């Protein structure tokens, strides 16, 4: 759903660091509000 960095955590490459930008953290809220 969002652009992930190389050393950052993700479902694929789940060894990444659990660190998030402001914009990234903002992208993740939107999945609930937008949907019916």
């Amino acid at each position: 759903i969002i652009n992930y960095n190389e050393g950052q955590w993700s479902p694929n490459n789940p060894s990444g660091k659990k660190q998030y930008d402001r914009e990234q953290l903002l992208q993740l809220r939107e999945v609930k509000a937008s949907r019916i």
Binding site: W9, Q19, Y20, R22, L25, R29, V31, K32
Partner: protein, 171 residues
């Protein structure tokens, strides 16, 4: 069932409501804990922003098992980066508090192990947003957090960003 994005740490939201009859420790209320970005927003979406909570209340976000107190072992030798805010926009206050929350859960600071939590105080006259640090005697870590704080929050010049040791604040 979609996968949630896990946070580096587990955080707990505290909510304090002033009461002349009660002691400051009894004013505190533990609300909930979370460890994913989605569960953070779910919480944030249903709680009053700082601009709407009663006069004399506090919101605190601290890592799990760290109470927002000087007395807590994690904060004993620590301090806090205090941001004092004159009577300003409600939107500006809520946005500033949210940005602090996002810095914390996002692990914006290099010395993540140095971060204990953040506290916002609503006092009408002047609102204060503080970020509690583990080791106040280490100027290196304190200042690193200070610059990241000035930058990330985009803090304006002549906005008071001051550090205080908890030992001194007790006076």
């Amino acid at each position: 069932p979609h996968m949630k994005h896990p946070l580096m740490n587990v955080w707990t939201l505290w909510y304090l409501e002033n009461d002349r009859s009660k002691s400051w420790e009894d004013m505190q209320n533990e609300i909930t804990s979370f460890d994913t970005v989605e569960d953070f927003w779910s919480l944030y979406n249903h709680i009053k922003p700082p601009s709407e909570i009663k006069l004399g209340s506090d919101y605190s976000l601290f890592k799990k098992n760290i109470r927002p107190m000087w007395e807590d072992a994690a904060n004993k030798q620590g301090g806090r980066w205090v941001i004092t805010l004159n009577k300003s926009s409600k939107t500006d206050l809520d946005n500033l508090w949210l940005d602090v929350l996002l810095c914390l859960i996002g692990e914006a600071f290099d010395h993540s192990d140095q971060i204990c939590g953040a506290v916002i105080n609503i006092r009408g006259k002047s609102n204060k947003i503080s970020i509690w640090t583990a080791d106040g005697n280490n100027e290196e870590a304190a200042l690193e957090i200070g610059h990241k704080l000035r930058d990330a929050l985009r803090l304006g010049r002549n906005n008071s960003l001051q550090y205080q040791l908890h030992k001194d604040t007790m006076v």
